[PDB]
């Protein structure tokens, strides 16, 4: 409600096309599409911004309003600037490298693991223990980041494993 | 100390059935036997009646408008319910604007005794007599710096002007006793 009532400020270098329920956006980083909910009406105001409205105040509409608003906001943000998630590797002997378009990690396993980058998402490495993943779809970026994080078992004794940029994991101590 | 106005209409039918119907219709049966007059069976509104009772209740004076015939009255009984809390019947007494009636007023303890003590209120209401319009809605008893083993009785209650205590002055109303310990609590 409080979020669904606000407009969506569209930058200059963006092309928004609404057709019924579907809505496509084109920008420098790429293009995206979305299908807003049925009980909500999306419209482009005279100032270019987008506005979503609800014909009723039921629970369904109140929950879908802000949902669709933030969805289109993230869509425009991604097609304008894109999303990026930095990670970090901790633990002696734990390393990561770039092999073409895929990432090869060695986290103490007997064999090195490989993660291939799907469409609309790329990887980058700034150090053998510092890398990041960039893309347009925030959902896909978060999914790939979570996959890369869960690749290794969470170890709170030594913190060995994958971690996000500003991750704060809990740590215990084994006195024996 | 001003009277609370309220409307009231005579009951066109008595009995448990009519009473249950009135209670379902958000009404409250009431009697107005008065101070020696023919009794009248009226129907008050539960909503505003409970509102007035929560505002200044406990034998609050009232002013019934029985078909435009304004008349003072005083509630001298309240049987709400054993389990739930609903006003199922009222008994109002005419005061005649000047009678001296005797009614029980609730007492309330205020203050803080010695930290190593505990206060117990044995009597909640006290038989008080005063003018119909000057009925105190509550009485106050202060407990400051009181030591253990102290018995504040009814006679020690400060009464406003024109107010008298009908009950004996020896009725123990408040008792401050040394705070029981774990042994005293477990040996009971």
């Amino acid at each position: 409600s409080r979020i669904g009532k606000q407009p969506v400020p569209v930058p200059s270098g963006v092309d928004v096309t609404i057709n019924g329920q579907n809505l496509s956006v084109k920008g420098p980083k790429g293009t995206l599409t979305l299908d807003v909910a049925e009980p909500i009406s999306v419209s482009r105001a005279e100032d270019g911004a987008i506005v979503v409205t609800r014909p009723d105040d039921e629970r369904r509409s109140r929950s879908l309003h802000g949902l669709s608003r933030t969805l289109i906001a993230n869509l425009v943000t991604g097609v304008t600037e894109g999303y990026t998630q930095k990670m970090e590797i901790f633990g002696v002997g734990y390393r990561v490298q770039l092999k073409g378009q895929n990432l090869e990690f060695a986290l103490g396993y007997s064999h090195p693991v490989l993660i291939e980058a799907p469409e609309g998402i790329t990887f980058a490495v700034e150090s053998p223990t510092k890398f990041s993943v960039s893309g347009i779809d925030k959902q896909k970026v978060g999914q790939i980041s979570a996959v890369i994080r869960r690749l290794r078992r969470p170890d709170p004794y030594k913190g060995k494993g994958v971690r996000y940029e500003g991750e704060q994991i809990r740590r215990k101590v084994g006195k024996t | 100390n001003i009277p609370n106005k309220l409307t009231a209409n005579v009951r066109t039918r008595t009995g448990k059935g009519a009473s249950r119907q009135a209670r379902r219709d958000g009404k409250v049966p009431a009697v107005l036997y008065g101070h020696g007059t023919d009794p009248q069976h009226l129907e008050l509104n539960a909503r505003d009646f409970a509102a007035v009772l929560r505002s200044h209740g406990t034998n609050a004076i009232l002013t019934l408008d029985i078909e435009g015939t304004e008349q003072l009255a005083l509630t001298k009984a309240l049987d709400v319910h054993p389990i739930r809390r609903n006003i199922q019947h009222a008994d109002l007494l005419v005061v005649q604007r000047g009678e001296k009636v005797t009614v029980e007023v609730t007492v309330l303890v205020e203050g803080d005794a010695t930290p190593g003590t505990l206060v117990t209120q044995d009597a909640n209401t006290i038989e008080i007599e005063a003018e119909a319009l000057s009925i105190p809605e509550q009485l106050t008893v202060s407990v400051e710096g009181v030591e253990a083993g102290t018995q504040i009785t009814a006679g020690q209650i400060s009464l406003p002007e024109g107010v008298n205590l009908i009950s004996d002055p020896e009725l123990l109303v408040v008792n401050v006793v040394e705070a029981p310990s774990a042994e005293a609590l477990e040996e009971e």
């Binding site: - | 054993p82 389990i83 505990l118 117990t120 909640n124 029981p180 310990s181 774990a182 477990e186």
Partner: protein, 134 residues
């Protein structure tokens, strides 16, 4: 545990549990009382358990009142003999409780502490109850 010193009759007829409570409905001694909503027998064991729970939740403060005393005995067969013989002997004492009858009361200053103690006590009873104030 509570138990009468001596009863005129040792064996009774399973005291009936019906209707609403006529007396003991309003709080008189304590400040916060527990009022039951279902008719059922309360045993001296349950009474002692609730009293111990209250006395443990409240340390060196307040006072507790028990407005019910278990005096109605309930017999019990040997649990292995056949049906039909002299009526069994009493084994546990109960207290006929009806909806609307105040069972326990507390005079603790801390309102929240008293409410928590009364809730923990009710949690040890075989019926539903609610906290009321003087």
């Amino acid at each position: 545990m509570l138990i009468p010193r001596k009863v005129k009759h040792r064996k009774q007829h399973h005291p009936e549990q019906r209707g609403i409570a006529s007396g003991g409905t309003s709080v008189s001694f304590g400040d916060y009382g527990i009022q039951a909503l279902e008719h059922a027998y309360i045993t001296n064991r349950q009474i002692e358990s609730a009293r111990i729970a209250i006395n443990r939740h409240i340390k060196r403060g307040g006072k507790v009142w028990i407005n019910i005393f278990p005096d109605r005995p309930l017999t019990k067969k040997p649990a292995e003999t056949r049906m039909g013989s002299g009526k069994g002997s009493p084994e546990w004492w109960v207290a006929n409780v009806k909806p609307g009858r105040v069972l326990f009361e507390l005079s603790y200053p801390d309102e929240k502490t008293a409410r928590d103690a009364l809730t923990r006590a009710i949690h040890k009873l075989p019926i539903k109850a609610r906290i009321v104030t003087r």
